[PDB]
Amino acid sequence: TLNAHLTMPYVMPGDGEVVGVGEPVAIRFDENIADRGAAEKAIKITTNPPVEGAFYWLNNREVRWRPEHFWKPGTAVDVAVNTYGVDLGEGMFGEDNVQTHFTIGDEVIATADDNTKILTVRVNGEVVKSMPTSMGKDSTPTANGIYIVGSRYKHIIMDSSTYGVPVNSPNGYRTDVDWATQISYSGVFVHSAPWSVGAQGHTNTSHGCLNVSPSNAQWFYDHVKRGDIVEVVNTVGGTLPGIDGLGDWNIPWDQWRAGNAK
């Protein structure tokens, strides 16, 4: 048992971490898993207060577990990945066992409504921040749906080629931003956008990201943690895919619950 041929599992979140109410347990293997039923069997999750949940695979090497609804603040979760030498199919076995313990913090849900161009942040049901925002313009719109907060960066470059769009092309970009909080693997961030403050609250001008003001982006970066929720509604976009990496809550319970072990 470590705390967070042969496949190593890697489990998230990390040991003792405090995460938001949208955080799934993630188990990721460094090899494709032929026998998902077996991987699932080998993973034991305990919650306090107890709550029902279920596994769903986002791809061939990574499985997720979450309840039906967002976690209750204060819940404590223990994850025991008992895979050492377990038959994982096609002559691959677990390299080791792994475990983690984490807790759920405050309920933090930020809702970006394209009808108002306001991103409103709610802590335990109390509006604590209202941020004018400027989202994806019509030709490169922001997808509707529930996004899980992922990592955060004081400064990074977002480069469109990372997502299959050349920098040189009409929808391309290579952009330095401050106070960048990632909310989808497909490239959506809430981040500082001093170049669209006139538009924020009025007009969509971005490639998909939630532009807010320098001090609202910094506030968001300071007060939000991995697992918190950004709900986007009413854009002319599609829906964020359930298998994004941070889209898990867009898969309806009945479909999630049934799983996809085979």
Curated annotation (Swiss-Prot):
GO CC, one annotated term: extracellular region
Keyword Lyase carried by entry: no
Superkingdom assignment: Bacteria
Binding-site positions, Ca(2+): 87, 90-91
Inducing or repressing factors: Is expressed at a level higher than other LDT paralogs at all phases of growth.
Disrupted-gene phenotype: Inactivation of this gene leads to altered colony morphology and growth, attenuation of persistence and increased susceptibility to amoxicillin-clavulanate both in vitro and in the mouse model during the chronic phase of infection. Loss of both ldtMt1 and ldtMt2 results in phenotypes that are unique and/or severe compared to the single mutants lacking only ldtMt1 or ldtMt2.
Membrane topology: Lipid-anchor
Cellular localization per UniProt: Cell membrane
Major localization class: membrane
Domain L,D-TPase catalytic: start-end pairs: 108-233
GO molecular function, one term: peptidoglycan L,D-transpeptidase activity
Transcription regulation in keyword set: no
Keywords for the protein's UniProt record, in alphabetical order: Acyltransferase, Calcium, Cell membrane, Cell shape, Cell wall biogenesis/degradation, Lipoprotein, Membrane, Metal-binding, Palmitate, Peptidoglycan synthesis, Signal, Transferase, Virulence
Top EC class for this record: transferase
Primary role: Generates 3->3 cross-links in peptidoglycan, catalyzing the cleavage of the mDap(3)-D-Ala(4) bond of a tetrapeptide donor stem and the formation of a bond between the carbonyl of mDap(3) of the donor stem and the side chain of mDap(3) of the acceptor stem. Is specific for donor substrates containing a stem tetrapeptide since it cannot use pentapeptide stems. Is essential for virulence in a mouse model of acute infection.
Name of the protein described by the UniProt record: L,D-transpeptidase 2
